[PDB]
Amino acid sequence: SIDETVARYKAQFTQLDTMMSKLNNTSSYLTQQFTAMNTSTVEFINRWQRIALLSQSLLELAQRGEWDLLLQQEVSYLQSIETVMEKQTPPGITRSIQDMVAGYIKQTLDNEQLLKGLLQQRLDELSSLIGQSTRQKSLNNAYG
Amino acid sequence: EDSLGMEVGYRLIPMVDFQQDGELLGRIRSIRKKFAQDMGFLPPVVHIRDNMDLQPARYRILMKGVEIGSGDAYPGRWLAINPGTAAGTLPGEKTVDPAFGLDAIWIESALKEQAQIQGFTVVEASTVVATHLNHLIGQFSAELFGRQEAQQLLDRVSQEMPKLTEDLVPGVVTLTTLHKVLQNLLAEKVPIRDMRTILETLAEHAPLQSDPHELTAVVRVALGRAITQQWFPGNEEVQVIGLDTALERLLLQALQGGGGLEPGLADRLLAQTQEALSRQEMLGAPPVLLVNHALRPLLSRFLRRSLPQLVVLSNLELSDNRHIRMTATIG
């Protein structure tokens, strides 16, 4: 069933391309909040650690080719960034906790630059797979 | 001589013998049967003849005595076709597939499953010859439809719907004109199955038009539902190649006598079209080029002469309810 698998290639292409566009919406929000940093204190480290951890999950799933699971984790990664948008920085910021978060915010940026680079090469591979599958469909109709 | 003939070597005799194997005879009958129900006319019979002077595994395909294709076939072996994505190589006689010209290898029967895992398409010997024969029939569909088959089709449809055919030939259109219109339809892979709409719309435009090329254009719009569904089956997004609006007006100006383009720009038009077939292929979209109605016969005859796989439809033929998106551009 080549026609059915090509449909899956097209559907995954648009879903990954939509994620690569929302990846730039969050890349501008994280870069500006990063430069803005250069008891409720605990629930401030976790809000920026959940972002750094979910960005690690997406990069690991991209390296391992789990694209279906990568699209399920995109939702939780987008929900976690909005939780940082609703809640501002607490007033009690020490020089040590502010620069520790600045290392976690910088971790997500270097994780998205590798994630976007991997999310792009999958779009480049899916375009090859669709082209090869339609050429293979012409062979099967002639000899079938 | 014979309209469609095929000569074969003595190793292919079992493939073409009812006394033993004869796998080809059943396939050739099925080829002619489906061709009569798809394109709407029965192709000429294939005269098969043994030739012990020919090479043992060689076959020839002739049309009116002229050789239109040769090749080899080994009944005990399989042909491993490489569509460009296969890996490694297989032992056997390296050759070329007769339909698309791809690289292929005749492999022993013990390598079929390994060929498949390596990405080859493995095809049996009788299918190689049948597919080659079936490929040439579609390529010469217009030529194999002579004036004899025109009269034969007319009498066949004159008994089904006598009121339409009686008043038509040779009153409004002669047999030569009707034949040339049907040839133009097969020449662009549009079937002549719906003889009602073809002849119905012929009777409405024959008293006002006697040009076969002009009558063909009107018929294609009358067959627009069939032409649309042939390349865009169902009800989804129609993805076509288009012309750059600057190029479309340049071409309309050249036909209107405002000034033609340089012959070097024509070479780019052929190249940009072939690139549009590749870009359309990477998207899983049909290889069709949608152009303004005034430009359709020109670009069809011009591009398809070099790129026959290209389909050129006019804007007046696509159904107005479909969602059209231009996925590739020439220019």
Numbering used by the authors:
A (entry chain D): 5 to 42, 59 to 164
B (entry chain A): 360 to 690
Q: What did the paper state?
A:
Type III secretion systems (T3SSs) are membrane-embedded nanomachines that export dedicated proteins from the bacterial cytoplasm. FliD and FliC are found in complex with their dedicated chaperones FliT and FliS, respectively, in the cytoplasm. Here we report the structures of the ternary complexes among the FliD and FliC flagellar proteins, their cognate chaperones FliT and FliS, and the export gate protein FlhAC. FlhAC folds in a clamp-like structure with four discrete subdomains (d1 through d4).
Several constructs were tested and the highest quality NMR spectra suitable for solution structure determination were provided by a ternary complex formed between FlhAC and a fused FliT−FliDC construct, wherein FliDC consists of the last 40 C-terminal residues of FliD. The ternary complex was readily crystallized and the X-ray crystallographic structure of the FlhAC−FliT−FliDC ternary complex was determined at 2.75 Å resolution. The solution and crystal structures are essentially identical. Two distinct interfaces mediate the formation of the ternary complex. In the major interface, which buries a total surface of 350 Å2, the FliT helix α4 juxtaposes with a hydrophobic cleft of FlhAC located between domains d1 and d2. Two bulky non-polar residues, Leu102 and Tyr106, emanating from FliT helix α4 bury their side chains into the FlhAC hydrophobic dimple. In addition to a network of intimate non-polar contacts, FliT Tyr106 forms an optimal hydrogen bond with the side chain of FlhAC Asp456 (O–H⋯O distance 2.3 Å). Amino acid substitutions that perturbed the binding interface decreased the ternary complex stability, with FliT residues Leu102 and Tyr106 and FlhA residues Asp456 and Leu461 being essential for complex formation. The minor binding interface features a salt bridge between FliT Arg98 and FlhA Glu640. To maximize the binding interface with FlhAC, FliT undergoes a dramatic conformational change with helices α3 and α4 merging to one continuous, long α helix.
